[PDB]
Amino acid sequence: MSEKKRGAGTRKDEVVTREYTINLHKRLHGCTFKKKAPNAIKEIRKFAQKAMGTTDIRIDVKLNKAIWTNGIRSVPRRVRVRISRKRNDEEDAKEELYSLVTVAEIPAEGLKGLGTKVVE
Amino acid sequence: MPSHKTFRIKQKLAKKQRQNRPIPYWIRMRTDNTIRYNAKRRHWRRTKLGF
Amino acid sequence: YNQDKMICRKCYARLHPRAVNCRKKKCGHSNQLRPKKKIKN
Amino acid sequence: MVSLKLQKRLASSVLKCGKGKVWLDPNEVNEISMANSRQNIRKLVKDGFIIRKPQKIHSRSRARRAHEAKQKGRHSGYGKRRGTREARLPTKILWMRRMRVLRRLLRKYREAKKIDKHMYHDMYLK
RNA sequence: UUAAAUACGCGACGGGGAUUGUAAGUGGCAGAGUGGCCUUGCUGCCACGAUCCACUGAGAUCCCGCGUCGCACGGAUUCGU
RNA sequence: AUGAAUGAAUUAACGAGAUUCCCACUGUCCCUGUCUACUAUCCAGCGAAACCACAGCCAAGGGAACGGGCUUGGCGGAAUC
């Protein structure tokens, strides 16, 4: 999923990731109070597709668990998601995130640091 | 219990069951004449057993 | 016969009037039998 | 295809347990498929790829502490206290205790010797 | 009916009101009761603290915004005298 | 045009039996609103019947006296949801 440059311009790429917050509320409140939880999962599967610019999206089981944990009638307001993004194929991989409580800022930085660490 | 037992209905039911098999690939071939759709061949869901 | 069979409350497994106990799997003198109440509607 | 439906019947009837407790690994899928026989299933159960899941838990714990929460009174103001009036204990259930005790006391009292045969009849009648 | 690298454009942050109303953690004791301990004695302690106060006009925000990050460089289809 | 075992009268208890009144309450009502759910709608797939001599505008009139159509008047851009 294109963090595709290629070529450009900065950004020497194929995969990297970004952390994005998916707001469940707007479409979620459109689903039923009992039937809410499946809607969220779809919401996530549509937003990443939009943001990422790719049709092919993978959502991690972790994400499934997160939405479902409260149950069917309760879904979290939002969920931070780590969405990684590589290939000519241009496919999306997503999973859950972490946060004390805070901000949107430079999530790209942590990822860049991870890839740099992997190594020898 | 048995599973209604008597040999005398029980065998004849088993005979009709052996009798309800496909025609044997061969009798289509030597053959005289027919779209050989056998036909007295009976089914667990539909129509109903007789004696 | 008026005794019918005894059916186990745990396993739910049917084992005689002469057998003392159930044994379907290790039920094994669990003694947790009740007879067939001997015929309804 | 892989049809795992038959190992699920077999798996259940050798862990002597349900089909939603019996679990089969997603690495071993071909080897599981290859088992066609219980003696093969038994081997995969022995070698621990097929396994009987534990599966949430109880609630004895709230309830036994609920019994310690009766031990020890509580909730015997009028409101929380309720099935119907007698049904809870018909008082014939307290009589079944009282009537056996009052006659057990009267038998102990004679055999220690405290009362006469005349007094014993009257009180037993009393 | 809208906007589009000829743009305060979108998402994510949060600042505003106008939204609802006292958090999680933390302490005290009006107040339950009960037990043991420390000490010459006096005296106090610990324990399991039912309920309350205290640190708090806290958390959440179908509405509204300026400071960062990410994406916004695009093309299908059509034909009229 | 009541009337005594074609039973008369009378009457406690009982009753998904018939009629009436009161309090309680309430959206039945003043008088309607918002909201949920499943439908609806749109998409992929599956896929029917009833019915069908008949082309299928209105106002009048006429006619076996209750016309989608004759007669005179008047109107109509089709097709489609």
Added chain:
RNA sequence: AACCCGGGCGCGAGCCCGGGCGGAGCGGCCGUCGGUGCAGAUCUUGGUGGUAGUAGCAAAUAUUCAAAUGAGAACUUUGAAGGCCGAAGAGGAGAAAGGUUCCAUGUGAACGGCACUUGCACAUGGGUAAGCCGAUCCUAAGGGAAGGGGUAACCCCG
């Protein structure tokens, strides 16, 4: 011959030809036979259009994310997450009834009111083992076998 298309005659019922198709039977005159002519009968049977790509596939809110396998995956199968069933709106054992529907392997024209790799669809193989379970033996409303007698007799009481 039949059929389709047209050309000619006859008011006309109907006659005739030309072209194509078809690929074996077909007429005319006279004299006779007669299952001898339809638009219709809420006519019969068969086929077929519009109705229509329309109604139904809607109330237990039930799946979702990864993955297997596969020419093909919303519905086959694994895991996780999430629910639902509770005297059984979906647990266990059985009577009747069914009648092989069971197991396995291989398929996929039809079914499943959709997909299907699946199946209780199709095909081929395979499975049910009793001295101690049940049948079996007994006897209960009664089915009665057995005089005599009505009744031709069927048949019926005893």
Added chain:
RNA sequence: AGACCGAUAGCGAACAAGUACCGCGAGGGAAAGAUGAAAAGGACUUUGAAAAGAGAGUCAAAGAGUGCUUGAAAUUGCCGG
């Protein structure tokens, strides 16, 4: 044997016919024929989700290609006026 019928006719039944099927039962009860002179009954090759399709082969003829003589009507598509 025939001024009989000739596959909606003649028997209900030209064939797998009192079959398939219906009814608890007594009883009820269909639809169902035709490649070609000869199987010569569609090799070999390309393709494809499957069937099938393309190309070619046999024959006087494949719109003779398997419920395969002829092939109306009612109807559908495409197309021409």
